Amino acid sequence: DDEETTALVCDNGSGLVKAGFAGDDAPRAVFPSIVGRPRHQGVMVGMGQKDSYVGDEAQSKRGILTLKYPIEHGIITNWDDMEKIWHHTFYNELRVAPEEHPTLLTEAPLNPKANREKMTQIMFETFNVPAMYVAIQAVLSLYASGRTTGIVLDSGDGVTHNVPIYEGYALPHAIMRLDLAGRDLTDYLMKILTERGYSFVTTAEREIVRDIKEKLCYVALDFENEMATAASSSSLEKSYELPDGQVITIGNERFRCPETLFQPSFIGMESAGIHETTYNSIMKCDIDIRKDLYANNVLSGGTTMYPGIADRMQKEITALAPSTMKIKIIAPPERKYSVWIGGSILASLSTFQQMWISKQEYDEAGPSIVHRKCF
């Protein structure tokens, strides 16, 4: 190596922004992507009260803020807040000016064009980066596993998408994007907790319900047997201490919250669960690469971290699939940061070094350059 510089592998995500320099093992700074203006009046003078706390600072003052995520389902709904989040990420969590570093954003499949074009326009005009490239969030997760084939189910917090890939040739007609993800599971858990008496309403208490979901919920291997067991014994009731005391006891809400993934009829969604959209995504592929996709099913994304999901999904697919094929589910322990590790690997490649969208190219063709050859 020598001259030259390092690339910034940012990964907007929806729920946790993960960033860091290319070539490492883990993102340098991981912090929730929330921007919360204060809502009360404020009487102390000279306290140095800011007008908007972003990132991990607003998870400590959340008692008097109104947190609001700037990314709803993959798409970005509030561009000013997203710009604020990016500015914070560059200047305070990494402390590297963007004028001297290429960036590699990530984007969900099948997203609106205007979102991607606005993203590149911001990165080139406001932050004024040298060159930026946008990559699909599933190809990176396939990089991180060290494979070159396989069908990856990247169940993030915003949107769950299922991109099949063979021998490096992506199959654009077999991408099945479903909008059920971690946020809907948080809302459903917050809605079923009311059956015991605990009411969480404020946008700050959604974070508490998210913590409950992360620490207690698990995916049942067989749903009916668990529903019958939890209704007779009491070996499942695990307690949890709120941020002020008054411990709560979660009964059969433990495995009913993440069960929504396999039965989206619980939250009123029509579509089939993540156990059947993978099989449908496979069956749309050609008849000769189905064995390889069956054997190399990859899990990624945060929401696939529930204890006991890699067995439930395998059981379901084995039920659906033909009896002869072998069904194997790759669930690496570093699931949460799989997309970012793959992004680092891709940015560190020499063959990839000429695919960046150089600034002079953007100046000649406008923001619509991203849809062109430089994808």
Partner 1 sequence: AQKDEEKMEIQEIQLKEAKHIAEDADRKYEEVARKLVIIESDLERAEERAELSEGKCAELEEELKTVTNNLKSLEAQAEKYS
Partner 2 sequence: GKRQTEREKKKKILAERRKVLAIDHLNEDQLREKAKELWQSIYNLEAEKFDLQEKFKQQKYEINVLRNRINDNQ
Partner 3 sequence: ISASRKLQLKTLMLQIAKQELEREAEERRGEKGRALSTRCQPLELAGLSFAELQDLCRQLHARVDKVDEERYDVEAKVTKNITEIADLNQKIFDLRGKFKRPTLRRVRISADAMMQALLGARAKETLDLRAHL
List contacts with partner 3 (CB under 8 A): 20-21, 23-28, 44, 47-48, 142-149, 341-342, 344-345, 348
Within 8 A by CB and 6+ apart from 218, the residues are 254, 255, 258, 306, 307, 308
Contacts of 24 (CB under 8 A, 6+ apart): 344
Q: Is 199 in the site for its own copies (CB under 8 A)?
A: no
Closest CA to 106 of 147, 58, 161: 161
User: Please, what is the minimum distance in Å from the beta carbon of residue 317 to partner 1?
Assistant: 17
* Minimum CB distance to partner 3, residue 307 (Å): 25
By a kind-dependent CB cut-off of 5 to 8 A, residue 149 interacts, out of partner 1, partner 2, partner 3, none, with: partner 3
Q: Is 286 in the site for its own copies (CB under 8 A)?
A: yes
For residue 126, the partner it binds in partner 1, partner 3, partner 2, none, with Cβ less than 5 to 8 A by kind, is partner 2
Residue among 7 and 165 whose Cβ is closer to its own copies: 165
The span from the CA of 42 to the CA of 18, in Å, is: 33
The reply to whether 333 sits near partner 1 by the rule CB under 8 A is yes
- One-letter amino acid at 292 equals D
Query: DSSP characters for 252-279?
Result: THHHHSGGGGT-TTTTT--S--HHHHHH
| 260, 235 contact by CB (below 8 A) | no
Tell me whether residue 18 is annotated as binding: yes
φ/ψ region of 204 (left if φ > 0, alpha if ψ in -120 to 50, else beta) reads alpha
Is there binding between residue 126 and partner 2 (CB under 8 A)?
yes
If we measure between CA atoms, which residue out of 58, 9, 14 comes closest to residue 29? Answer: 9
Q: From CA 277, how far away is CA 153, in angstroms rounded?
A: 10
Nearer to its own copies, 46 or 268 (CB): 46
CB of 86 to its own copies, least distance (A): 25
Confirm whether residue 14 is marked as ligand binding: yes
148 binding partner 2? (CB under 8 A): no
Report whether 302 belongs to an annotated binding site: yes
Contact status: 45 vs its own copies (CB under 8 A): yes
The binding site for partner 1 (CB under 8 A) comprises 307, 326, 328, 333
Q: Residues annotated as binding site for ADP?
A: 14, 18, 157, 213, 302, 305, 336
